Amino acid sequence: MNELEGYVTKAQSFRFAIVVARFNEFVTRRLMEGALDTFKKYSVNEDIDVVWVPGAYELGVTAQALGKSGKYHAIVCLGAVVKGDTSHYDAVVNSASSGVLSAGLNSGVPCVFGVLTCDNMDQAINRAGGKAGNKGAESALTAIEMASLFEHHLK
C-alpha cells in the first residue's frame, strides 16, 4: 500500500504532442482545441506540437513515430469516427484503437486514445464539450497524469 499516482500539478516541465485526424474536423478541431487549452490551463509550457493526419487510421504510425522520437513524454491522439453506415466504421475504429495501443506499447510512451467512437454525430458533439464533457480535454489531462506517473514511479 503505497499509492503511486501521477501528478497533475507538475505539468509545465513536460513535453507533449497531440495528433489529430482531420476527418470529422467539425468535432476534432474542437476536441483538439480542448486538449490544447487544458494543457495551458494546467500551466504546461513547451508549446505542444500538434500533428495533423487526415484520418484516424493514421494515428497509429504517426504516434508510433512521435513516440519513438523520445521527444515527448506523452502523446494524445484525437479523432472521431461516427458510425455513419458500414462495418468500415469497425475497420477504422479497430485500426485506430489498435494503432494507438501498439504505439504506446512499442514506444513505451503513453499514447492517449482520445478518439470518439459514438454512433451519431450528435453524441459526438456532446463528448466534444457538450453535456458529456470533452474527451479532448480529458485526454490532455490524462496525458499529463501518465507522463508524471512515469517520472515518480518510473520503476
Ligand X SMILES: O=Nc1c(NC[C@H](O)[C@H](O)[C@H](O)CO)[nH]c(=O)[nH]c1=O
Tell me the catalytic residues. Answer: 88
493514421: which residue's cell?
Answer: 58
Does 64 engage in binding with a copy of itself (CB under 8 A)? Answer: yes
Q: Which of residues 126-145 bind ligand X (CB under 6 A)?
A: 131, 139, 142
* Distant-in-sequence, close-in-space partners of 127: CB < 8 Å, separation ≥ 6: 116, 118, 133, 134, 135
Which residue in 75, 78, 116, 140 binds a copy of itself (CB under 8 A)?
116
Q: What's the CA gap between 32 and 140, in Å, rounded?
A: 9
What residue ranges bind ligand X (CB under 6 A)?
21, 23-24, 54-58, 79-82, 84, 88, 92, 112-114, 131, 139, 142
Which residues are known binding-site members for 5-amino-6-(D-ribitylamino)uracil? 23, 56-58, 80-82, 113
